[PDB]
Every structure is written in C-alpha cells, then in structure tokens.
C-alpha cells in the first residue's frame, strides 16, 4: 500500500 505520513 502507498502511505503518506509526514
């Protein structure tokens, strides 16, 4: 899965 966690 793609994760955007900033």
């Amino acid at each position, epitope marked *: 899965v793609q*994760i*955007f966690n900033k």
Partner: antibody
Framework: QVQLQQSGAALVRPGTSVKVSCRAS????????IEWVKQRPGQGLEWIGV????????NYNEKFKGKATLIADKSSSTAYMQLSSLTSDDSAVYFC????????????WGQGTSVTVSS | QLVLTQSSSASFSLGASAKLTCTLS???????IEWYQQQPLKPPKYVME???????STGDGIPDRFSGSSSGADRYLSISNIQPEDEAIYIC?????????????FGGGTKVTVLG
C-alpha cells in the same frame, strides 16, 4: 492570496554555509508541511526534504542528510533551509512548496532563491 | 526503489492530441502520482493528482484540454488541443512512506515541443 515568499539571491563562498528562508502568507502554517526542491541543471527537479512545522519533524532525501537542515518557527510563519559546506554543484535555484500531510501534491510554490557559489 | 520513468523529449503538431507517459516502478504500480508543469524562469506548476482508477483532480488555472488516465503501472497526461502555451517540461511526482520516513520522487521530465 496564498503566497510563499523566499529570501533573495545569495552569493556563498565555497566551503561555507547558507540559510534560505520561506515565509508563508494567507494560510495556517502548522496545518500544512513545507517541502524543499532543487532545480536540476538541464531539466527536472530534485527533492531535498520536508518539515512538519508543528512537530519539527524533518524527512530528507538520503543525498541531503548532512548537507541540508530544515527548520520552521511557528511565530513568524517562516521555514528555513541551511545548506552546508557548499561547492559549485550547490549553485542552483532552490524552491519551497506547500503540500498536505496526506497527499503528494506540491500545490503552491515559492518564487525561488538563486544560490551562486564562487570565490 | 520508488522510480518514475519518462522519455526526455516529445513533439506534437499544434492542435493534435498529446499523450505523455510516466511509468511507475513495478513494485508501486498502484500509486497516486502528481503532474507538474515546468516553464522558463517560472516556479513549477501543479497540474493534477492522478490515481490508479484514472480519477484525476487538476489544480487551479488548468484548462479542460488537460486530462488524466491510468493503464496499470502507466500514468498518462493527455492534452487535447496542443497549444503553444502548453509547451513546457512535464514532470511526475510520487510520495510513499518507507519505514516511518516520507520520500518524494520526481521523474526526469518530458520537454514537450509543439510542432507546426
């Protein structure tokens, strides 16, 4: 109205360091992340890193660890990038850009800071 | 790792339909990319978010001629009427969090020359 105003053109002597500044306007600084990108020589962009303004959380491109240092100061709604021990390779246009904490889109970009490294 | 692939240059008879290819590393064939437009001494411009279902979500200032589609590991930017002003470098960007570290990766860019 959403505006990212970056610092002016800077002449850096080789082997020295530079601080570039990105001041946010017309939005809540802490609600978004500030990202930094370098203009490549012929065509293209090179991601340097991102700063989470509320947490101080920084991620970097492997290549810029020990070269770049991202900081942000909630008070003045301004983000700063320090680039260290500069060579002529560091001579380029550096941009700051805004992104959500959830998506990859850099939706609003700064005007750019042109860095010249020379003796 | 995460790699976006584009041809450097593409040319299109003015008025014709342009289709630009940004291929994703096979391990990440389902990823959502962004398109960006790079023109001279101007900051780069946000074009769209493009998901795997072909769903697109273009940014402010972008004409209808700009469309988006997906075909597996291939993300596409379609310009219906290739106009002189559309002449630019088109770059695709992608984000992922490996470990707890956020990376963003740009492709090499496609310099589009409008011909005729």
């Amino acid at each position: 109205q959403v505006q990212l105003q970056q610092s002016g053109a800077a002449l850096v002597r080789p082997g020295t360091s530079v601080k570039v500044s990105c001041r946010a306007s017309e939005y809540a600084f802490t609600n978004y992340v500030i990202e930094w990108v370098k203009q490549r020589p012929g065509q293209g962009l090179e991601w340097i890193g991102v700063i989470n303004p509320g947490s101080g959380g920084t991620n970097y491109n492997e290549k810029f660890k020990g070269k770049a240092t991202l900081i942000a100061d909630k008070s003045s709604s301004t983000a700063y990038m320090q680039l260290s021990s500069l060579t002529s390779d560091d001579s380029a246009v550096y941009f700051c850009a805004r992104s959500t904490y959830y998506s990859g889109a850099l939706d609003y970009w700064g005007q750019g800071t042109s860095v010249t490294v020379s003796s | 790792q995460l790699v976006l692939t584009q041809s450097s240059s593409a040319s299109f008879s003015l008025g014709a339909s342009a289709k630009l290819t940004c291929t994703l590393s096979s391990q990440h064939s389902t990823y959502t990319i962004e398109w960006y437009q790079q023109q001279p001494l101007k900051p780069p411009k946000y074009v769209m978010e493009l998901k795997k279902d072909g769903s697109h979500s273009t940014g402010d200032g972008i004409p209808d001629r700009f469309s988006g589609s997906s075909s597996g590991a291939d993300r596409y930017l379609s310009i219906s009427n290739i106009q002189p002003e559309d002449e630019a470098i088109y770059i695709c960007g992608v984000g992922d969090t490996i470990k707890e570290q956020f990376v963003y990766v740009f492709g090499g860019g496609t310099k589009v020359t409008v011909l005729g």
